[PDB]
Write a protein that binds this ligand. Structure first.
Ligand SMILES: COc1ccc2[nH]cc(CCNC(C)=O)c2c1
Ligand SMILES: COc1ccc2[nH]cc(CCNC(C)=O)c2c1
Ligand code: NA
Ligand code: NA
Ligand code: NA
Length: 164
């Protein structure tokens, strides 16, 4: 990428759901660390806030089960506007970043539409300088994120009290 110092690569996705936005904002953003463990206990050992109160500045730690190739991830809540279902958060540490990635930055913005939602999600990979993004790992991340979203949607539809 010379003469550049660094690069950033972005995926933009738009989605629609029958789940109301405040419920998705909790399940998929603010309490994702908890919900991953509930949804996929054979993959995730634990998910915990290790700094902060659940608003801006929070750091979470998600730990995979010992048998899984991956070990842990740290995310930081960089910006939250909960009234308007906006969050920016960053995956800044963990062996899911492999050798090549410095951080992944996520932006989520939801809106209410009838009894459901629409959302825009923006995922930006920041390779370390001199390193290249691995397309395989990006596509796995995307597929797993989508699968998890669908699991959450199904559970929330079936259990209206959750995150109500
Ligand atoms: C969404 O939940 C899952 C479930 C199973 C999984 N396996 C491996 C990953 C990590 C995927 N990479 C990133 C950057 O997310 C994963 C995530
Ligand atoms: C307890 O709270 C929650 C909250 C959000 C959730 N999403 C998913 C599940 C679990 C069940 N899912 C399956 C079998 O696919 C879940 C539980
Ligand atoms: Na959908
Ligand atoms: Na592991
Ligand atoms: Na992704």
């Amino acid at each position: 990428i010379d003469p550049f110092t660094m690069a950033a690569y972005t995926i933009v996705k738009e989605e629609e759901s029958p789940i109301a936005p405040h419920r998705l904002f909790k399940a998929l953003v603010l309490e994702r660390h908890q919900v991953l463990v509930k949804a996929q206990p054979h993959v995730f050992k634990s998910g915990e806030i290790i700094e902060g109160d659940g608003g801006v500045g929070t750091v979470t730690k998600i730990t995979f089960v010992d048998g899984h190739p991956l070990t842990y991830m740290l995310h930081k809540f960089d910006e939250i506007d909960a009234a308007n279902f906006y969050c920016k958060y960053t995956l800044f540490e963990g062996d899911v970043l492999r050798d090549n990635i410095e951080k992944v930055v996520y932006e989520v913005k939801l809106e209410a539409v009838g009894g459901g939602s629409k959302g825009k999600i923006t995922v930006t990979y920041h390779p370390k300088p001199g390193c290249t993004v691995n397309e395989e790992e990006v596509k796995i991340g995307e597929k797993k994120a989508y699968e998890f979203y669908k699991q959450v949607e199904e559970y929330l539809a079936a259990n209206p009290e959750v995150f109500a």
